Amino acid sequence: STSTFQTRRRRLKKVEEEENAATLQLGQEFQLKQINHQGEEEELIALNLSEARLVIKEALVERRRAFKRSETREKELESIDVLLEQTTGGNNKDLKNTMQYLTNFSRFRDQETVGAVIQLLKSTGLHPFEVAQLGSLACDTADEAKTLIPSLNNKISDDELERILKELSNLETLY
Amino acid sequence: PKDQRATTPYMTKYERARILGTRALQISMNAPVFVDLEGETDPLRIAMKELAEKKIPLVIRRYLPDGSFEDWSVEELIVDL
Amino acid sequence: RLVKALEDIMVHYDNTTRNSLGNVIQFIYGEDGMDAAHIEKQSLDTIGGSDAAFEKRYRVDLLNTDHTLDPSLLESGSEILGDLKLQVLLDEEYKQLVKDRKFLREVFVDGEANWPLPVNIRRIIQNAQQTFHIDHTKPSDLTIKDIVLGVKDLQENLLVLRGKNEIIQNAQRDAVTLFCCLLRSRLATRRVLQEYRLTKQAFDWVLSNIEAQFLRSVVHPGEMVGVLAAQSIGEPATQMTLNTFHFAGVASKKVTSGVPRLKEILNVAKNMKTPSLTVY
Amino acid sequence: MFFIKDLSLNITLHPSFFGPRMKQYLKTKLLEEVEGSCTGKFGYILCVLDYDNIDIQRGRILPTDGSAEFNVKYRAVVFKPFKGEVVDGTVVSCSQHGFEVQVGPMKVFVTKHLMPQDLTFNAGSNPPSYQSSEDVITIKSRIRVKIEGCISQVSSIHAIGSIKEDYLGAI
Amino acid sequence: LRFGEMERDCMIAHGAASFLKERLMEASDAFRVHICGICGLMTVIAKLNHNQFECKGCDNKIDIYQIHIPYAAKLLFQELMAMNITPRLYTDRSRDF
Amino acid sequence: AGRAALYKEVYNVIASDGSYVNYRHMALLVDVMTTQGGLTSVTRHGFNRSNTGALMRCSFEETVEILFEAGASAELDDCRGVSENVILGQMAPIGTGAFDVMIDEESLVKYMPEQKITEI
Amino acid sequence: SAPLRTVKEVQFGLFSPEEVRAISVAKIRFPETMDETQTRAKIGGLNDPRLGSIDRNLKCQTCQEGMNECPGHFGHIDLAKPVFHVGFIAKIKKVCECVCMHCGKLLLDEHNELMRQALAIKDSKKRFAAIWTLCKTKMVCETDVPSEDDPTQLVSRGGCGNTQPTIRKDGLKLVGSWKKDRATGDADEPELRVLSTEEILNIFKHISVKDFTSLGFNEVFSRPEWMILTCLPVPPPPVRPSISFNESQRGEDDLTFKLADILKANISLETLEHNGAPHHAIEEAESLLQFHVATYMDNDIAGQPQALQKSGRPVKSIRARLKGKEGRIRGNLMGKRVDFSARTVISGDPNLELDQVGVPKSIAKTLTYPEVVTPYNIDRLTQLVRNGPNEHPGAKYVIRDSGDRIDLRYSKRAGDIQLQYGWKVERHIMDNDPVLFNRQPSLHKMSMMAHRVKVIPYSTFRLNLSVTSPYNADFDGDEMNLHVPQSEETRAELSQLCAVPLQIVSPQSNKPCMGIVQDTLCGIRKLTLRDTFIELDQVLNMLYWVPDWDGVI
DNA sequence: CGCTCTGCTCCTTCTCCCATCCTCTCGATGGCTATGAG
DNA sequence: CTCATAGAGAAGGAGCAGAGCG
RNA sequence: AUCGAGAGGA
Ligand SMILES: [Mg+2]
Numbered sequence A: 001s002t003s004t005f006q007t008r009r010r011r012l013k014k015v016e017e018e019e020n021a022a023t024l025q026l027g028q029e030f031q032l033k034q035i036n037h038q039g040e041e042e043e044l045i046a047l048n049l050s051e052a053r054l055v056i057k058e059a060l061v062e063r064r065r066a067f068k069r070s071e072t073r074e075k076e077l078e079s080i081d082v083l084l085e086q087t088t089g090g091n092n093k094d095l096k097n098t099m100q101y102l103t104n105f106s107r108f109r110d111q112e113t114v115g116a117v118i119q120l121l122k123s124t125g126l127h128p129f130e131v132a133q134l135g136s137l138a139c140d141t142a143d144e145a146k147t148l149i150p151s152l153n154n155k156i157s158d159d160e161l162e163r164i165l166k167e168l169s170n171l172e173t174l175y
Numbered sequence B: 001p002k003d004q005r006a007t008t009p010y011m012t013k014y015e016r017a018r019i020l021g022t023r024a025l026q027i028s029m030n031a032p033v034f035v036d037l038e039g040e041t042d043p044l045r046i047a048m049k050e051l052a053e054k055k056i057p058l059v060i061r062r063y064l065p066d067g068s069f070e071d072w073s074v075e076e077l078i079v080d081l
Numbered sequence C: 001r002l003v004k005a006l007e008d009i010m011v012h013y014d015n016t017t018r019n020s021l022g023n024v025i026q027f028i029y030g031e032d033g034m035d036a037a038h039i040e041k042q043s044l045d046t047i048g049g050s051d052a053a054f055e056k057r058y059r060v061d062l063l064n065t066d067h068t069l070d071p072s073l074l075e076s077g078s079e080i081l082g083d084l085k086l087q088v089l090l091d092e093e094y095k096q097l098v099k100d101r102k103f104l105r106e107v108f109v110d111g112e113a114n115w116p117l118p119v120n121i122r123r124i125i126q127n128a129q130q131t132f133h134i135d136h137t138k139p140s141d142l143t144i145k146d147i148v149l150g151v152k153d154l155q156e157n158l159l160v161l162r163g164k165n166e167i168i169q170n171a172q173r174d175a176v177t178l179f180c181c182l183l184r185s186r187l188a189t190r191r192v193l194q195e196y197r198l199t200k201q202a203f204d205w206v207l208s209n210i211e212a213q214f215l216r217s218v219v220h221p222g223e224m225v226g227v228l229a230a231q232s233i234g235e236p237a238t239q240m241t242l243n244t245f246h247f248a249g250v251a252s253k254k255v256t257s258g259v260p261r262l263k264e265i266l267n268v269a270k271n272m273k274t275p276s277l278t279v280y
Numbered sequence D: 001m002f003f004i005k006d007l008s009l010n011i012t013l014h015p016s017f018f019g020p021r022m023k024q025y026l027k028t029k030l031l032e033e034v035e036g037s038c039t040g041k042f043g044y045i046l047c048v049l050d051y052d053n054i055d056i057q058r059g060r061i062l063p064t065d066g067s068a069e070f071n072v073k074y075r076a077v078v079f080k081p082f083k084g085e086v087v088d089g090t091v092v093s094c095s096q097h098g099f100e101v102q103v104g105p106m107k108v109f110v111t112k113h114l115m116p117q118d119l120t121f122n123a124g125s126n127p128p129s130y131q132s133s134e135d136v137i138t139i140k141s142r143i144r145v146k147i148e149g150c151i152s153q154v155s156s157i158h159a160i161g162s163i164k165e166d167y168l169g170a171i
Numbered sequence E: 001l002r003f004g005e006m007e008r009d010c011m012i013a014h015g016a017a018s019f020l021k022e023r024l025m026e027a028s029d030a031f032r033v034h035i036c037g038i039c040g041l042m043t044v045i046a047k048l049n050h051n052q053f054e055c056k057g058c059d060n061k062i063d064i065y066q067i068h069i070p071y072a073a074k075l076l077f078q079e080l081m082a083m084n085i086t087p088r089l090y091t092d093r094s095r096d097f
Numbered sequence F: 001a002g003r004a005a006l007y008k009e010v011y012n013v014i015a016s017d018g019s020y021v022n023y024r025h026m027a028l029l030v031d032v033m034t035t036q037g038g039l040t041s042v043t044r045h046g047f048n049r050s051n052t053g054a055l056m057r058c059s060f061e062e063t064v065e066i067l068f069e070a071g072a073s074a075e076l077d078d079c080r081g082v083s084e085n086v087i088l089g090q091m092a093p094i095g096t097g098a099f100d101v102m103i104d105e106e107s108l109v110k111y112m113p114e115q116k117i118t119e120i
Numbered sequence G: 001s002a003p004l005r006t007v008k009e010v011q012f013g014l015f016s017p018e019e020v021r022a023i024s025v026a027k028i029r030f031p032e033t034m035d036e037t038q039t040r041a042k043i044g045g046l047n048d049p050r051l052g053s054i055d056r057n058l059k060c061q062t063c064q065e066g067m068n069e070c071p072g073h074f075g076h077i078d079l080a081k082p083v084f085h086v087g088f089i090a091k092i093k094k095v096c097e098c099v100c101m102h103c104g105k106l107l108l109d110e111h112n113e114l115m116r117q118a119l120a121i122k123d124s125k126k127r128f129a130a131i132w133t134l135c136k137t138k139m140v141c142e143t144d145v146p147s148e149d150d151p152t153q154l155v156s157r158g159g160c161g162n163t164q165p166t167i168r169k170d171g172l173k174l175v176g177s178w179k180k181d182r183a184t185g186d187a188d189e190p191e192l193r194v195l196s197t198e199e200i201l202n203i204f205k206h207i208s209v210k211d212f213t214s215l216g217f218n219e220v221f222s223r224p225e226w227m228i229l230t231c232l233p234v235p236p237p238p239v240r241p242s243i244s245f246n247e248s249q250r251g252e253d254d255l256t257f258k259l260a261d262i263l264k265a266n267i268s269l270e271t272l273e274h275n276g277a278p279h280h281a282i283e284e285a286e287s288l289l290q291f292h293v294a295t296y297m298d299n300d301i302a303g304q305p306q307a308l309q310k311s312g313r314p315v316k317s318i319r320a321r322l323k324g325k326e327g328r329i330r331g332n333l334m335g336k337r338v339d340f341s342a343r344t345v346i347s348g349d350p351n352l353e354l355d356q357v358g359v360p361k362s363i364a365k366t367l368t369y370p371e372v373v374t375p376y377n378i379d380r381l382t383q384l385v386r387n388g389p390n391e392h393p394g395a396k397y398v399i400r401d402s403g404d405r406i407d408l409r410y411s412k413r414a415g416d417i418q419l420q421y422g423w424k425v426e427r428h429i430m431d432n433d434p435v436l437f438n439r440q441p442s443l444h445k446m447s448m449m450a451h452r453v454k455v456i457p458y459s460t461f462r463l464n465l466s467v468t469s470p471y472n473a474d475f476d477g478d479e480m481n482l483h484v485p486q487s488e489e490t491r492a493e494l495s496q497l498c499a500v501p502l503q504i505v506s507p508q509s510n511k512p513c514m515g516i517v518q519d520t521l522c523g524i525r526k527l528t529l530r531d532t533f534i535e536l537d538q539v540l541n542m543l544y545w546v547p548d549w550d551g552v553i
Numbered sequence H: 001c002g003c004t005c006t007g008c009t010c011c012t013t014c015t016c017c018c019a020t021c022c023t024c025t026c027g028a029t030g031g032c033t034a035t036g037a038g
Numbered sequence I: 001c002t003c004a005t006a007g008a009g010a011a012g013g014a015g016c017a018g019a020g021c022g
Numbered sequence J: 001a002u003c004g005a006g007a008g009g010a
């Protein structure tokens, strides 16, 4: 395994990085602005809970389609188990747990709804991390969001937080 | 570098040796061939056959003064150097 | 010590010679890129040669009877004669050849005609005569353009380098200048017709063989010149016994030589115990 | 929470390789190493992105033997939590010691000292829940855990977090 | 039969590093080592069937490399240890060129 | 002018009564000694006293005397030395080691004809 | 499972006592050795405290591994007192030419463009050489130093505000001579005293990184305090051989012995300082330790102070053990013994080809080659098995795929073997094998050749007579140098490397490496005479004789 | 006008390496001084 | 109280011969 | 095993 790309500057052990705090204190590995192995600036793709499902669903279908080259939450869970039989054999149980998990906590189950969610958050210039926190975080009020996310507390107005939040609430009803 | 490969279009005896040895090794390792084992048991003669025919599963990395490199396939190269 | 001293010397893919620092010691292999294995010492026919002899051997005229060639010797000789623009065609290379002579008297002012060269036409023409079993009583089918324009092309076709830099191309041009001089000299048109009676079939055949060898005479890269050079000098250096005397000489005084001289040279010992000068 | 990145895997060709199923195999091999892998550098390998279109580069010959080198590029998404990060997780298990919580592909420690002090274990309340206050928490219930850190193991990672806060707690 | 420098010089003139090396190590040397890459020194606790070869002072059980080196070369490293002169044998060429 | 003249004498006197042996190569070796715009002395205070790989310099003459400076300045082995790599049991970038044979993915596709067995 | 890699960048420098202790396998504190004095063991804090293994003692940092692929481990003796490393004493001595005490920097500064030009030298190795050249004039640590621009403004920086001391050679250390010697009656002649190591360390303490790096060095990998020895390495028994002469006797690395002596000497010093003693007693014990260590490390100490080991043997210091000439650098590092080789007397033979060597069957009997099993040679290989190690066209070993070099000398498998593809059939040497032959010494490629085998009775190498030309040889008992290739790839390369056609002409002068035999030549001259004619019957036999004859008279 | 600081140039001094590979036997260490039992 | 026993180089160095500010 | 000296070979 690699996951390197960024060339080193000090091979000798120095300080061992900075503390991995949720306050945007992400490491070089989790650098918000970085370049992938295509030579393309791949900014940290801080994937959200519900859109992760969209990615996973697509991936489950992908693997299945690649192989072919060679609704209620419960109904979705039933479908997941079918896809697990189609794509794995008890391997990567991490994924098995994750998709059932994300389904259980889904708030934006459909792509169209998610697209709107993404649009609202990125339009305000939130860090990928901050976007991920809000895209995944269910929330009743800006006071909850600010308390749970201090970087909003010290940067974003409540008017905008509530505006988007209640629009997101509507988008949650629009799963 | 694609058509930017500025080295000659000919393959050297050094490159040849590496190739021959490589294929001979592969023959001794039960590797598939481009030319069938027509009676002859000697890998060097066997390799010589497909070597002469330039039917070799191989590309050579040549290098630039800046440390970069050039892609020269066996078929691409002219076996005469 | 010398082995170690000369250890770090090698040829890159780009045929430059450099050390391990990448420092380009020499931008081109032996100033030619041609393999010594395929180089032989032979005489060039334009180092000496009187003014008249030069003209007589190389000049050809379609209007001046003095250098007019036999009109039957060449199948179309009688047709060509009189046509001034073709006399010019010939003169292009002729004047260049006499210019070449002007250069050569300076290039090798010591009068040495016999030099190590990659190309030996005399051997080639031996091959050609035998290859086609040439009947020297019959008229030749070469045209004046096959000879003149064909050799211009031949000169252009001596592609030893692989690149696109005008400058290195110039270097290439200089490298085979002696050869294009040679082609103009040793193989001047009247030599071709009178001296060789070359047929077109033979001519054409030869041209293909010229390049074949030209290619075959080229140096490989990735070479450790250091050890190769060290052996080429060191092995015979040990065979070169004796130092300052007992191998005849000119000066009555003994002359620092052999390894005494070698050593003071090797170690930059500027202490000339036999500090001579030759003033002309 | 999950992080997508174009990664690479150095797969080495050996003399056992002779037939006609290159990337087909390599895709299998890649997944065998990569899927489910867990190291603090990235957390948990949730999923490899783009099964097809695999950039195996080449079989650079390794002249020391009959081997050759293929550095293989692919995308993949990983799970990684940070200190003080708020997470809507769900309970895996429960004992008098505390709870085991599932988040994505990772297990999280939510002990009795990370939970509210007015909440104690009550074996009489099944599933073996904590039941001495309004925060009754069962194995079958869900839980919002703020991950305070990552107690990385060698083969896996056990994060640690808490729910003792106004906007944290059972779900 | 002792190998001489001139025999080396011949291999050099030949470019026959191949033969040179099979005699150099395949028929007269080589040693399998575990070097702890992170510091470039063989700071490797030998946890063979555990795969837990901790690098003391680094707390590193991962950045360790397997290298087939001349036994004499092994000794060279160890000599440098005895000599108090550092040689951090890293496998990563950070020097772009 | 002196470089050329030196060589002039080298040929005339050092070679002198011997045989022809690539005068240009002889000349090259002279050029080598003076590529820096100076003149290298074949000794510990000349050839050795360079800015090159210490290991190579050690194999020439001195030992720890060199190493002491390498330790002081904290030098680094860039692994590009020809003989140094050999010393390390590695293959040098000369002759057989001067190039890297490979089988590119591209060509492997080329090696997927009816003779699919040429795929690896 | 460590990944297979290749070293690309080796960072050099001096080890950090700090890290040394941190990575130490054992502290090592026992002034004694093996068996703890007759107890059938080793030593608590020496030899076995997680250190390398010995004969039948698996230990190896209690990681066993026997003593095959089993590297050992080093302990590290912390030193009570700091010791100056000799190779760096000289360097420090030179550094002190510009050292300015208490300022963390030097006597010279940026306030003089000429100084700035010295500072502008890219190569620090030359930079400070220039600095030494310049700073030696007026070595005075002025507290305030006049700025280049309007010198009436002085820049504070001379932390010790005084003249700087000079250095004199004095045995293990150097004597500080604090400049002074002023106009008032040679006032305070350079305060003389041997320099304190601690004083020097105080310098190091105040040395700034900025200026340390302006002097090159390396603030990470070469720090000034690492020039002082305050902790020494303790090699495992394999590195510092335990040895055993005659029958199970001792004879171990005398540096273990001398080191123990050094430690014991240190212990007496410990007592002199701990219980108390005259400062001269303390002084001398320490002086002796600097001495013992200096000679321990490198016994090339100023001629006179170079003690001979207890049996009258010039103490073989660390360096002595590690010297060149022969030593290590040439001893093995520039020449190792070859397992597949031979030294066999040559002879001539006019009947053989240039690359066809009459190889003694006695050699063929002693030598083998690792071929491998293929479906198109199995039967022949089983014949080799049937031939066993007895026939000259037989075989001695077969490495079974599992890694088992089967010994056919004892095995009854001469009539029973399941050869699978790839088993390494270590057959006897056969005809045409491209084996290397050479005649040393030589300064050219000609001398090393690869040739085809022709096995012969009687022995000695039967060689084509003309071979003496490229080898500049004769047949005077020359034990030909042989090397037998084990790589098939190499065997192929040899046909592409040392074939006579590929060697016979040397581009050096582009000349052929041999000519006609002098007997033959003169004969040919006779043969080429006008009176030379030949009888049909003579011709007939000649026609047969000549292998190139086309059947036409 | 004389004396300090500086400049280079001379002798004096220390220190260095000295061919390549290969084959044998004769030799291993030596004269001196303090603690405990029957 | 009595024996027993373990030549050639570079490098450095000291002296000898000048310019400039107090 | 191990180094030291000597004799000899080319
Ligand atoms: Mg002889």
Ligand SMILES: [Zn+2]
Residues within 6 Å of the ligand: E035, E036, E037, E038, E039, E040, E041, E042, E043, E044, E055, E058
């Ligand atoms: Zn390490």
Ligand SMILES: [Zn+2]
Residues within 6 Å of the ligand: E046, G060, G063, G064, G065, G069, G070, G071, G072
């Ligand atoms: Zn071990």
Ligand SMILES: [Zn+2]
Residues within 6 Å of the ligand: G099, G100, G101, G102, G103, G104, G105, G141, G157, G158, G159, G160
């Ligand atoms: Zn100071």
